[PDB]
Amino acid sequence: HARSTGPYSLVTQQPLGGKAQFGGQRFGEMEVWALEAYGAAYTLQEMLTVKSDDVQGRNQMYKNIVDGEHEMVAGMPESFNVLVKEIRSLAIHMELE
Amino acid sequence: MSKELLLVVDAVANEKGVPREVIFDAIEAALASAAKKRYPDQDVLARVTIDHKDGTYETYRRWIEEQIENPDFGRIAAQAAKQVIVQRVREAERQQVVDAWKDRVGELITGVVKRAERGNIFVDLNAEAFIPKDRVRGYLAEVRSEPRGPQLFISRAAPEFMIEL
Amino acid sequence: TEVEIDGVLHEYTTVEGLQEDVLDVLLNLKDVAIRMHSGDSATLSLSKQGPGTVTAADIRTDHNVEIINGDHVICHLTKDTALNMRLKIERGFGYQPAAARGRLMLDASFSPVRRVAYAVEAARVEQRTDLDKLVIDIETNGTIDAEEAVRTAADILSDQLSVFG
Amino acid sequence: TDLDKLVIDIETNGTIDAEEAVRTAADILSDQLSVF
Amino acid sequence: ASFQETTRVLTEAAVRGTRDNLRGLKENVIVGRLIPAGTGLAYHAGRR
Amino acid sequence: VTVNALRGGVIEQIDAARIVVKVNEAEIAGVDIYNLIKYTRSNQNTCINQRPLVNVGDVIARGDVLADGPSTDIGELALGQNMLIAFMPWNGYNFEDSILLSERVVEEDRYTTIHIEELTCVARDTKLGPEEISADIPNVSEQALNRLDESGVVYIGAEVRAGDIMVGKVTPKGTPEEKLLRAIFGEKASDVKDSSLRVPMDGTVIDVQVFTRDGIEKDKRARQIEENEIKRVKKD
Amino acid sequence: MKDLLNLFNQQRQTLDFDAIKIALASPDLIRSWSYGEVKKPETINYRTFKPERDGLFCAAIFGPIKDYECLCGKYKRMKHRGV
Amino acid sequence: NEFTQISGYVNAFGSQRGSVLTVKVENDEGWTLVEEDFDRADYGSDPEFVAEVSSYLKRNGGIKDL
Amino acid sequence: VEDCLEVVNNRFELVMMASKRARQLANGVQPLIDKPTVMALREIAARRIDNALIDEVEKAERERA
Amino acid sequence: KGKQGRFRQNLLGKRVDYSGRSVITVGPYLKLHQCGLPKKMALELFKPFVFAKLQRRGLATTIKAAKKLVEREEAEVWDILEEVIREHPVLLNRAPTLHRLGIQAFEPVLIEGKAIQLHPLVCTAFNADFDGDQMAVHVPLSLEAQLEARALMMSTNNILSPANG
Amino acid sequence: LKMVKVFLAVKRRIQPGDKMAGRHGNKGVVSNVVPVEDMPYMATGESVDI
DNA sequence: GGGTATTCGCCGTGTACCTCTCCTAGCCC
RNA sequence: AGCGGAGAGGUA
Ligand SMILES: [Mg+2]
């Protein structure tokens, strides 16, 4: 099975899992360790931010693919904002200076 | 169901400039398209004869007539009748604006402004007019823009407006 | 290629009066071999009712369509149920599946030859060197003969070697 | 999709052409198949 | 606080009020910036 | 998975779906009859089948088999096939626990298995309106509507493909032209949503089971299969 | 639920910072964090699909359910903002 | 029902009514050049719909991105 | 890829230079000698394009824009 | 905290798109830098590039007609898929990645099957057998990611082991 | 109000890549399908399948 | 006031994938 | 109509 773009979860902006409902393959931690062992800054940045996590980033990358121009703008993952909102619910102030 | 459509066609939204004859022709054309989509052999025109202000719904088929037709539910026929109805309503509104432009009077027009783009403006006189510079009461009359409905063209500054004043 | 039976809708149902299933009848029809003299298509029908076995010789054949005597049975009938079955023969080569080509579909293996073996032996003949001979034992299903098989094999070789020059 | 492509490498010493050698080989095989 | 005893490191950073300068490899994955190793060293050189 | 004869006797009445035995005076008032399952799905989406093996008019004893079950011979357990094996490396195609297959193991249909899938179409009741099983679906071409009947569902024994509409289901999602279209028709002109059952795996449809609730008017195909079931139980 | 005009605009967040500071939170700062106070432990009322006012799932505290819509339905336009 | 600019193109207008987006391209004189309707359930995905609207705005007269 | 590791010592600088050359070639420009990245690596390995010439072409494209 | 928390399941390891998995077989005819890829799998993975090339070639005015032409599966979409995949590397990954060389880049070719063919000199570094082994693939789509996969992730560049010489 | 269950029977053939094990624990995966003319044959002409 | 000597807790213990079922249901009419 | 928490089996 394979997929290009399917449905996304609402708790965190990430694709689903499994052969059903067009789930994506989980890019594990050891694969991220191997890509960090390769170096590969631009490959690892476009893997866990642009393709998976960012809402506007995947739309901008998709329209830049179908338009022909090359202008990649990265952003913060939404799961980091979920973690910030979950830490702030524990009466602990976490600010992005 | 004869008066239930009579309470619908009698609205003054599209029957103020041109009366309910062309709306009846649009309804007859939509039901003829539905009967042609229901029948497997669609090569002749069907006549849906509806009388004036009574609403007797009867479907015929002329090939001069050959046989009778019969309606059905037709959800795809309902979608086809909807697009033929809105296309014929657009055609009738284009006919209404062009005959109100071309049969009332060809002379100076008086209206208020509605929109203003970069180097252009729109003058409302339910017809829309263009403001050429190459509320206002300029004297200019021309016919163009045959696709998307013909619209009248006035000007903000014209020598005919100075000659008439 | 295809089998058309009036009482059998799809290839997974059960018909009254038959001991085996429909898939056993389809495999037994795939097992038999049919030799046709002329033509690229044919249609054979069979009619067998009452108790008793159904062989390949019980079908109705044409003058050009020749059937092997068929000691292998097709199905087994028990009750007094009529079996009206229509077949279709087509020409081809190799193996064609049912996907890439109340109507049934059957696979076809267009290969009359089962196994080919050969061995090279030496022939004591007064010549300039040691000339060797070879023997080829062809085992078929009775459809094709061993002479026209190697004749069309040499024809295929001469048509394939015609690209050079 | 299921087709085979044949690539033959010929290294002749230089007394004859390689295409001429392939042509004479095909002619010899065609005569040996046409005798039978 | 990435692999073991998240509560202890979290309450220590909450009491002391530490400031993470993001000079690492895993925290750039968490934040979402480039990795400061390999092709991403020029971006970190041009940033500072 | 196999049936066994409790009392031996004559098997003079035999069918592919049922086996009727006739007991003797020593074992016996009525005779015994064994019904065989033909094609039903298992828990692992596989096909189970019971094909008979006895003939017409042969005596048996207590304990003999009458129909071989799924993956079962005449009394031995059968899991696979028998085929020629050669232990030799062949051009790297059997490199590291890889298996090489010939054309003769494929063209004779030795490993062809039958899988039966369960695809359901559930018609819930919503607040805007109940979903129907009508066949008139907008924005659907006739090429996907030829296999549908007047009931809205597919026929029995129809070759479908991936993406084919098997059960046609619509749901209501809730300008003067729309009012004119709603008055010209019988309140079924527009405001509908297409949500039908599609095939995810191409094959034939072997059985169509329709479940209905009380207080709902039955469909003509449901009435037809009800007549078929009562005719079948009256016949047997 | 469904919105397509707001979905097209991008580059709204820059996400450019240097460090991350974590500290404690004063009760006045927690009061300045939130937008409303909850008082009832009711999330979703029975026999209707509508959120409960002043509950865990409320529109007066967190936000509306449907996009550019209220609970009653007095404002059903995209032009009304900040009202 | 008012055509609202999507704030991604200098010459673009959009109108959504029942999960159907009406996108039109206006001329500098004010006349609408082209107009098409794009559904949501036919695509089944978000960036494919974004790519469709972007390609329809780029091929049918996209002068600038302001 | 051995000649590309021969004309420059560092590998990541080669990756960044080939990325800049592929970004310049993908917008449409005449190459020095079919994919844009493969043509950029072939122009790097042939000692035809330099980083200063890449910066000059990028400055010319920024001035022309 | 924990393994199933919001820190280990959504921040370090994330689910990614443009990716799929399949079983692996052995391919002796392949080279070291290239690997096999199924036709439908590569059509599902390289779908945006296929859509962009179909918009550039002019075979479809909108992406809806291009999507219907992709699902119709004619020969032109195979020509587009063959022209796109020619110089585009993909990242092949083993499901355990304890090795440094668990992720390698290959130039895929289109095969008529349902599995991912692999060179026999690759599975030694992957420590992968050929009995029920599955490998997840990933495609880089940016130019920097493609050049990084060509330079420092190719199988021809990773000859020596990271542990010893 | 109504439930419709449709039984779909698919008959799948053998494909290259399918897992097939023996009787003593020697599992394997089918590499490719080879024609009969390329398979090794004995002295009598019987072609080996596997 | 101050050193051993137990002792109560705190915190952790591989990755990736594929199928299936079952989810708070209890009561006085 | 999409967003999920347990239990069981199986493969590497
Ligand atoms: Mg293994």
From Swiss-Prot, chain C:
Keywords: DNA-directed RNA polymerase, Nucleotidyltransferase, Transcription, Transferase
Any one GO BP annotation for this protein: DNA-templated transcription
Protein family (similarity comment): Belongs to the RNA polymerase alpha chain family.
Domain notes: The N-terminal domain is essential for RNAP assembly and basal transcription, whereas the C-terminal domain is involved in interaction with transcriptional regulators and with upstream promoter elements.
Protein purpose: DNA-dependent RNA polymerase catalyzes the transcription of DNA into RNA using the four ribonucleoside triphosphates as substrates.
Subunit and partners: Homodimer. The RNAP catalytic core consists of 2 alpha, 1 beta, 1 beta' and 1 omega subunit. When a sigma factor is associated with the core the holoenzyme is formed, which can initiate transcription.
Protein's name according to its UniProt entry: DNA-directed RNA polymerase subunit alpha
UniProt source species: Xanthomonas oryzae pv. oryzae (strain PXO99A)
Higher taxonomy: Bacteria, Pseudomonadati, Pseudomonadota, Gammaproteobacteria, Lysobacterales
Gene assigned in the entry: rpoA
Span covered, complete protein: 57 to 231 of 332
Curated annotation (Swiss-Prot), chain G:
Disulfide cysteine pairs (residue numbers): none
Binding site for Zn(2+) 1: C70, C72
Family, per entry: Belongs to the RNA polymerase beta' chain family.
Function: DNA-dependent RNA polymerase catalyzes the transcription of DNA into RNA using the four ribonucleoside triphosphates as substrates.
Subunit structure: The RNAP catalytic core consists of 2 alpha, 1 beta, 1 beta' and 1 omega subunit. When a sigma factor is associated with the core the holoenzyme is formed, which can initiate transcription.
Protein name: DNA-directed RNA polymerase subunit beta'
Swiss-Prot record, chain K:
Record-annotated disulphide pairs: none
Signal peptide: none
Assigned protein family: Belongs to the RNA polymerase beta chain family.
Assembly information from the UniProt record: The RNAP catalytic core consists of 2 alpha, 1 beta, 1 beta' and 1 omega subunit. When a sigma factor is associated with the core the holoenzyme is formed, which can initiate transcription.
Cited function: DNA-dependent RNA polymerase catalyzes the transcription of DNA into RNA using the four ribonucleoside triphosphates as substrates.
Protein name from the UniProt record: DNA-directed RNA polymerase subunit beta
The organism of origin for this protein: Xanthomonas oryzae pv. oryzae (strain PXO99A)
Gene symbol of the encoding locus: rpoB
